[PDB]
Structures are given as structure tokens and as C-alpha cells.
From a paper:
Here, we show that the SiaABCD proteins play a key role in cellular aggregation and dispersal of [name] in response to carbon availability in the environment. With our study, we demonstrated that the protein phosphatase SiaA and its kinase counterpart SiaB target the protein [name] at threonine 68 (T68) and provide evidence that the [name] proteins make use of a partner switch mechanism to balance cellular aggregation in response to carbon availability. A partner switch system (PSS) typically involves a PP2C phosphatase (SiaA), an anti-sigma factor with kinase activity (SiaB) and anti-sigma factor antagonist representing the target for phosphorylation ([name]). As such, that study is complementary to our data and strongly supports a model that the [name] partner switch integrates environmental information, such as carbon availability and surfactant stress, to control biofilm formation through the modulation the activity of SiaD through the phosphorylation status of [name].
To gain insights about [name], its crystal structure was determined in this study. Native crystals of [name] were grown in C6 condition of the JCSG+ kit from Molecular Dimensions (0.1 M Phosphate/citrate, pH 4.2, 40% (v/v) PEG 300), with space group I222 and diffracted to a maximum resolution of 1.7 Å. Clear electron density maps allowed complete tracing except for residues 101–103, which are located in the flexible loop between the α3 helix and β5 strands. The [name] protein comprises six β-strands arranged in a mixed parallel/antiparallel fashion and three α-helices. Notably, [name] contains a putative phosphorylation site at threonine residue 68 (T68) and as such could represent the target of the predicted protein phosphatase/kinase activities of SiaA and SiaB. A hydrophobic pocket next to T68 is formed by residues L61 and L63 projecting from β4, W95 from β5, I71 and M74 from α2, L107 and F111 from α3 while L66 belongs to the β4-β5 loop. The hydrophobic pocket next to the phosphorylation site of [name] is of particular interest, as it seems to be involved in the stability of the SiaA/SiaCP interaction. In addition, a large patch of negatively charged surface is present at α2 and α3 near the hydrophobic pocket, and could thus be useful for drug design as potential anchor points. In addition to SiaA inhibition, [name] also represents an exciting target for interference, as it is structurally most similar to bacterial anti-sigma factor antagonists with little homology with human proteins.
Residue numbers in the entry: 24 to 123, 127 to 147
Write the structure that this text describes.
């Protein structure tokens, strides 16, 4: 029932899991030394949110640089969402970026069957 709240740092993104709104938000860069230490709890929170109810989950991402292990961690989250979506769970994602090509976002989008908006600002 609790929210997820990871404060951002120079090398790790700020992450907010809003349980009641069914919103998972992330902002910043992600080049931690140990990405599963940072994202394991996020994967867990998403798993629990999907298991404890039927409400929709929305991801709102404002991620900048992602190192290799962070790319793998996000693919794991997206794969959880995709599995849930194929089961009929409403899932949607917004990927914000500043034009000043979102190539990584487009590659992730090709792996997802739920609405996945790549949005310049």
C-alpha cells in the first residue's frame, strides 16, 4: 500500500511510485555502480502493484543518460508491464525528452504492445 520514494542523486534517478494514483515516475540520469540495488525494489513495487489489484498503471519517464545496467533494469520493468498488458491489464507509458532522436526510447517502444508515447518538449 505504501508509495515508492527514491530521492534522486547525481548518478541515480528520482523515482516516485504513487500507489493510489497508479503512477510510476522517474527523473534524471541513471549510472549507478549497482543498478539492481537501486531498481530491484522498483521491480518489486511494480510486481506488488500488479498482484494486489486490477487498477491501471502509468509510467511517466523523464530519464536522461542510462548506463548499460540501467537499460537492463528498465527492460525488466517493461517486460513486467508487457506480460501484464497481454493479460488485459491497462498499462501506458510516457517517455519525455528534450530535442535539444530518442533512439533508446524507440527501441524500447518496439518491444512494448501497450501505449508508449515518446514526447518531445
Amino acid at each position: 500500500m505504501s508509495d515508492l520514494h527514491i530521492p534522486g542523486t547525481q548518478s541515480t534517478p528520482a523515482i516516485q511510485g504513487d500507489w493510489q494514483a497508479g503512477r510510476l515516475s522517474m527523473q534524471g540520469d541513471s549510472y549507478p555502480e549497482n543498478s539492481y540495488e537501486l531498481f530491484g525494489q522498483v521491480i518489486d513495487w511494480v510486481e506488488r502493484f500488479l498482484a494486489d489489484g486490477q487498477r491501471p498503471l502509468e509510467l511517466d519517464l523523464r530519464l536522461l543518460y542510462l548506463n548499460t545496467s540501467s537499460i537492463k533494469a528498465m527492460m525488466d520493468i517493461l517486460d513486467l508491464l508487457e506480460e501484464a498488458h497481454q493479460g488485459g491489464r491497462p498499462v501506458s507509458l510516457r517517455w519525455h525528452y528534450d530535442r535539444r532522436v530518442a533512439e533508446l526510447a524507440e527501441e524500447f517502444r518496439e518491444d512494448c504492445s501497450f501505449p508508449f508515447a515518446i514526447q518531445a518538449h
